[PDB]
């Protein structure tokens, strides 16, 4: 009723994360998987439960894939399970803050709004995007008012990644740029690499990835630490040990070295084209606050690599323009930052926002859907 604490939920191809507001850490994080088979056939499970299942004959499937809902029935089953078993909450006496990708269509948006307002008899609902919340999660205090809003967010979801040049809380609809990499494709590539030489499938792949996969400013000028010191050949075990080799050194370079798996353009060039397509009087700020997000983005030296690449590209372009003109310009300053938020910045930003009282007003009321119907929200 706008007085209790609002619930923050975020579904995803890789991990669904749900919890409450006014918290420093999220709650109920788990990989977003469901498992099922007088007669009802209603025995099902989700999350780590479903993962541990399938030993007694329980099927498995991923509701959402490629960043777009596919089965509203299973999605509603999943929401019902997570809302009536994991969280003992009441959907009526609490407001809901849902997040959807910038590419979510109005059909799916209104389907979710209806299945939430009607079946769960909710009271207040607010659908938003991940870009603005991930950006808001960048600053630390959030009250000094010296924060910045103009930024260039890049979210690498476990299934798909994309980039948005936000400017003063005004999202862009054209300069948006997606890419199907930076997700389970890296895991599949590392698995295919491992299955070639060492037969001993994907669980260990993602484990060793999150454990040791890092980047390097170069590869061919690199590979030298490997040729010299065998110490890089770590030994990871699950059930026996496995030779890492060079997966930890090659996997993340898929971004800066595309067209290695199932073509695309490197990330620096992509973000440069995005910033150029955007208006001119906002690039000086867009290049300044470049925040990241998504687990697949929280690599070891991702920020330094991207910053160096984009800086050298912009410097080459400006030097071309200069030597063509003859004057001397002021070298634009590019910066990157990731302060213990790129992992789950979306939920942190959502909660920080919901903490405001204006959330209760910006939400949608049940009577609104009752009188207007399912055509309330159309597009951002």
């Amino acid at each position: 009723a706008s007085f209790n604490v609002p619930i923050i939920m975020d579904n995803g191809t890789g991990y669904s994360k749900l919890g409450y507001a006014g918290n420093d850490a999220p709650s109920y994080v788990f990989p977003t998987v469901i498992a099922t088979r007088a007669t009802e056939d209603l025995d099902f499970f989700i999350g780590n439960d479903a993962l541990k299942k399938a030993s007694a004959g329980y099927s498995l499937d991923y509701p959402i894939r490629h960043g777009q809902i596919e089965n509203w029935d299973h999605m509603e089953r999943f929401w019902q399970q997570s809302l009536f078993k994991y969280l003992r909450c009441e959907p009526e006496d609490h407001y809901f803050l849902l997040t959807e990708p910038p590419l979510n269509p109005p059909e799916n948006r209104e389907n979710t709004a209806e299945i939430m307002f009607e079946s769960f008899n909710c009271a207040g609902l607010y659908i938003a995007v991940q870009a603005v919340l991930a950006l808001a999660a960048s600053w630390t205090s959030s009250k000094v008012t010296d924060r910045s809003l103009t930024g260039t967010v890049v979210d690498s979801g476990d299934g798909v990644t994309h980039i948005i040049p936000v400017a003063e809380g005004y999202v862009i609809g054209s300069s948006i740029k997606t890419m199907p990499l930076a997700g389970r494709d890296v895991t599949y590539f590392v698995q295919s690499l491992l299955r070639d030489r060492n037969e001993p499938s994907l669980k260990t792949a993602e484990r060793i990835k999150e454990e040791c996969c890092y980047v390097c400013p170069d590869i061919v000028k690199e590979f030298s630490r490997f040729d010299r010191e065998p110490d890089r050949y770590l030994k990871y075990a699950s059930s026996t040990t496995i030779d890492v080799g060079f997966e930890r050194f090659l996997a993340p370079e898929i971004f800066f070295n595309p067209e290695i798996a199932s073509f695309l353009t490197p990330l620096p060039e992509l973000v440069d084209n995005v910033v150029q397509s955007s208006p001119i009087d906002v690039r000086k700020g867009l290049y300044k606050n470049i925040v990241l997000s998504g687990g697949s983005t929280l690599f070891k030296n991702f920020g330094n690599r991207l910053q160096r690449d984009l800086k050298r590209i912009v410097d080459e372009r400006i030097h071309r323009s200069e030597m063509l003109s003859g004057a001397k310009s002021g070298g634009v300053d590019v910066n990157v930052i990731s302060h213990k938020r790129q992992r789950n910045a979306v939920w942190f930003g959502g909660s920080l926002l919901a903490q405001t009282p204006e959330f209760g007003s910006y939400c949608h009321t049940k009577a609104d859907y009752e009188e207007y119907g399912a055509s309330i929200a159309r597009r951002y």
Partner: peptide, 7 residues
Amino acid sequence: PAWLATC
């Protein structure tokens, strides 16, 4: 893009 500045 190919106007040496804007576009």
